[PDB]
Amino acid sequence: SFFTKLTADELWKGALAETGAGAKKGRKKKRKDLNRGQIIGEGRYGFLWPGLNVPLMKNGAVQTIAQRSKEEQEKVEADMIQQREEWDRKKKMKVKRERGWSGNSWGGISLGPPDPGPCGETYEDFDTRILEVRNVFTMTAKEGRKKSIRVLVAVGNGKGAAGFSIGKATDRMDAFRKAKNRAVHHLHYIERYEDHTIFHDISLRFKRTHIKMKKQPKGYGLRCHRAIITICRLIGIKDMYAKVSGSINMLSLTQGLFRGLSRQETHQQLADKKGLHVVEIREECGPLPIVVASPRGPLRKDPEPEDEVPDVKLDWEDVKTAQGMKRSVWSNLKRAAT
Amino acid sequence: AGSRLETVGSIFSRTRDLVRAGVLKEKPLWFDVYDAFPPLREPVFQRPRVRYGKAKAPIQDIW
Amino acid sequence: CPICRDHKLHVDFRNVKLLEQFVCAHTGIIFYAPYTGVCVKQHKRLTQAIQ
Amino acid sequence: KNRAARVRVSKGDKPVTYEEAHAPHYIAHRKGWLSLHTGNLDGEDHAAERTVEDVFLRKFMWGTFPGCLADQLVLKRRGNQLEICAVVLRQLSPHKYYFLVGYSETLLSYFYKCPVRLHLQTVPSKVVYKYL
Amino acid sequence: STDFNDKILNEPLKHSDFFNVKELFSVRSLFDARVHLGHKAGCRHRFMEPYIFGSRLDHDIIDLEQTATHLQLALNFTAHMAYRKGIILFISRNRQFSYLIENMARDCGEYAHTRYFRGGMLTNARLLFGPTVRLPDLIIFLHTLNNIFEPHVAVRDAAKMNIPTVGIVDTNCNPCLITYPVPGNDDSPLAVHLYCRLFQTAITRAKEKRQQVEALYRLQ
RNA sequence: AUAUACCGCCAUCUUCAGCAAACCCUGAUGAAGGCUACAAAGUAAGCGCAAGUACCCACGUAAAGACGUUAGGUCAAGGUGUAGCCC
Ligand SMILES: [Mg+2]
Ligand SMILES: [Mg+2]
Ligand SMILES: [Mg+2]
Ligand SMILES: [Mg+2]
Ligand SMILES: [Mg+2]
Ligand SMILES: [Mg+2]
Ligand SMILES: [Mg+2]
Ligand SMILES: [Mg+2]
């Protein structure tokens, strides 16, 4: 019967069942366009109506109602099938997504530069990296086990400016937008020795996460936890070692790493603080000292005590490595370039 | 943009660092005035803390 | 691997511009194979060519 | 909860026209009827015939102008003249619009034995009354 | 135009005191205004110990010696900002002096916010006022404590937004985040009047000097 | 056959005023939280309520009543996915 016919929108609504009791709590098909591959005035009988589906005027005169031959209509049908197949293939193809720390993990995936600011500010120089994605839930009075996405993103320009932000949203893309927009307003500046590494060894314990970062020479690479590698790439650090101990909660690690890197003291700051030259001894350069930093104010005449035995607390792991007793099979493995 | 990390460094330090990094395209109106006439104490944040042991406020009685 | 995926990259001792990309500029040590992903055959060819 | 001809709220992403936005209980309050004829008045006959004709006219115009209809038709009857006032989109070419108008006029006239005038009002895009 | 703007802006920065604000106040004037009276020893905040001259019968005495230098620096900075035509916003939740501060701001051609400070008025300004709104270039706290004696949230908001803050810090106030803290009494009408008069005079001097310098150069 | 795939029309709290995208802030940047008017971080477009409308007032009765809960009902209004019979 004709009078029971409905519209494509209502039919797809009924078919796909996009809404329903199941979808509320997650207790397969997708929409298709059945009007794209049609030209108004084309039917199975292959009639050619002047002015609608064939040009109205031919030889400067109105064309007549025509009909394609049987074989010509079959040719048109084959062409339509071919166009349908081409569209189907263009839908079948998939994006060759670059994978992060693992094929199905968001960590390390790049979200691109943060959106331009309301005042026209542009952060095209910046890059955003996802460090974590949690599907946090929370029981509600009526909605029950609500689902939300907690995202952590680090934004950096590879020139010492880098920050991180948490993102809460029901939609993953919304969380990405929120986090990568909120991070740019929370940028730190990380001082880099020679623009490739930290200025000194950093030992810290943020909450229950211990971070031990060792300054390293040029070309040593990033031998660090993967999140630390991502954050170092964002900052602009190329050579550094880093060991994480205790709880390795990603947010705790990120916050502690940024705190330590921000709190590091530059060579110039040390020179000003102690009123003395800062001298660097490079083995490749022999005994030739290199004055890396010198004080701005009056250089002290006091030679500073030459302590016979320091009282600094030593890391047992570092002492063990220096003595060579550490037999860890996993230590100093050959790994891809970082 | 700026750096809303008010607990990290001072406003001057953050602004100077971002300007050096190029994040801030132009210095703020107050930057040069501050640099010329910095305050006696850098406005670095500092969490207050109660004195627990034998430590006491070094405030003398005016007699 | 990088060398085998571009036939035009011929590993010869005169292709110093290509060989310099598999030697650490700061220390002059040939990267071990896992560093660059080069297969063992091409890594041995690269080592011989660099030497 | 009531569901009759109501566009349920969303995150401010779906545009809707006046007709779609306004709910059934607003008929004759903020929105008029889409069809005007004497069938439904007191002591008037052939309301069923008029309703069937209107339903077929809508299902015919929608299919004859696929996607070209911006908003529902407006059917008016005067004596025997039937006026179909439609709001369409400025996408299809004027030649094709005129061909379809003439075809529809002739076919509907010969099918319902009454003169039919099809008036078209073209707009760049679906008129947006509010975002729901 | 570069040379013009340079000689207009950078030139005052070459002088130790380009506006002669030192003439606006003296330690005796502050003492008469009672700038030196603080709260009880119990109400003392830990970070005001360096600025407290001592305690007299469990009442703290703010060292006007330090207050003089701090106020000199703060007034010089305020004058420089006003000369450079930045936006100066006075802030005080003291309902006693709300009207006086509003009148002073309206007279000096600067802005005042003595009312309930709605959240996000600085951090969320681009939404609460329009994306193109311009934020204050300097914030002057005539009272750094809100009406529950906690620090005025505008202090933290200005620190977040990188807006320099001049501020009168009493003995129970927290001066860590105030860019230019002026340790002094903030609860007495005489002290509040002295502060308002000094800031109004500095702003008016800076603006009139700016106009005079602009005219002087453009005449050339 | 499947209302435990749905549209469509509805029961239900509802004789409720809450739901709120987008921002900002607090929690050391954890799940989460954001209330004090002599105000102490909330601002919120939109929806709902409200307002407006019908009946005889401006009253009252209608109507309306968001988001969600009960995989609440309806494959037997009709259509439709899936599966199934096709002498
Ligand atoms: Mg995989
Ligand atoms: Mg006080
Ligand atoms: Mg059901
Ligand atoms: Mg009911
Ligand atoms: Mg009712
Ligand atoms: Mg109502
Ligand atoms: Mg059921
Ligand atoms: Mg049942």
Beta-sheet strands, E only, within chain A: 47-48, 57-58, 61-62, 66-67, 127-134, 137-139, 145-147, 149-156, 161-169, 188-189, 202-206, 209-215, 222-223, 240-246, 278-281, 289-293
| Residue-wise DSSP of A160-226 | SEEEEEEEEESSHHHHHHHHHHHHHTB-EE---BTTTB-SS-EEEEETTEEEEEEE--TT--EES-H
At how many Å resolution was this determined?
3.2
* CA B34 to chain centroid: 12
| Residue B18: closest CA among A272, A123, A293, A294 | A123
Residues in contact with A140: Cβ distance below 8 Å, sequence separation at least 6, in sequence order: A146
Record: contact A185-B17, CB cut-off 8 A: no
Helix axes E189-219, E98-108, angle to 10 degrees: 10
Q: How far apart are CA A200 and CA A1, in angstroms?
A: 83
Q: For residue E23, what is the DSSP state?
A: G
Mutant choice from C1, C22, C24 vs A, greatest count of A C-beta within 10 A: C24
Task: Provide the residue type at C1 as one letter.
Answer: C
Domain count, chain E: 1
Question: How distant, in Å, are the alpha carbons of A3, A249, A331 from that of A211?
Answer: 73, 12, 17
Q: To the nearest 10°, the Cα dihedral for C38, C40, C41, C45?
A: 70
Q: Quote the CA–CA distance of A102 and A111 in Å, as a whole number.
A: 16
Nucleotide nearest the Cα atom of E150 (by C1'): F40
Q: Which residues contact E88 (CB under 8 A, 6 or more apart)?
A: E78, E81, E82, E110, E111, E136, E137, E138, E139, E140, E203
Q: How far apart are CA A182 and CA A128, in angstroms?
A: 11
Q: How far apart are CA A259 and CA B10, in angstroms?
A: 15
Residues 44-63 on A with a CB inside 8 Å of D are 49, 51-52, 56
Structure tokens, E17: 């005191």
3-class SS of residue D73: strand
Q: With contact defined as beta carbons under 8 Å apart, do B60 and E54 qualify? A: yes
Chains touching E, CB cut-off 8 Å, 3+ pairs: A, B
Q: What radius of gyration, in Å, describes the C-alpha atoms of chain E?
A: 18
Question: What angle, rounded to 10 degrees, do the helices at E189-219 and E64-83 form?
Answer: 40
- Choose among A251, A255, A253, A257: nearest CA to A134: A251
**Domain with E133 in it:** 1-220
Q: How far apart are CA E101 and CA E95, in angstroms?
A: 10
Residues 6+ apart with CB under 8 A from E17: E72, E76
| Nucleotide in closest CA–C1' contact with D11 | F21
Q: What is the largest CA-CA distance in chain A?
A: 110
CB atoms under 10 Å from CB of A197, counted, come to 22
Burial class of B60 by CB neighbour count within 10 A (0 to 12, 13 to 18, 19+): exposed
Whether A163 contacts A187, CB under 8 Å: yes
Distance CA E108, CA E201 (A): 8
Q: Method of determination?
A: cryo-EM
Structure tokens at A69: 């031959």
Contact pairs from chain A to chain E, CB under 8 Å: 6
Query: DSSP character for B6?
Result: T
How many whole angstroms separate alpha carbon B4 and alpha carbon B29? 18
In 3D, which of E51, E47, E46 has the Cα closest to residue E64?
E51
Number of neighbouring beta carbons within 10 Å of residue A289? 12
Q: What letter represents residue A228's amino acid? A: I
Backbone angles phi, psi at C34, to 5 degrees: -60, -25
What is the DSSP annotation of A106-130?
-TT-B--SPPPPTTS---TT-EEEE
Quote the CA–CA distance of E213 and E219 in Å, as a whole number. 10
**Which residue(s) pair with A212 in the sheet?**
A203, A243
User: Cα separation of A145 and A149, whole Å?
Assistant: 13
Beta bridge partners of D71: D87
* Bridge partner list, A139: A145
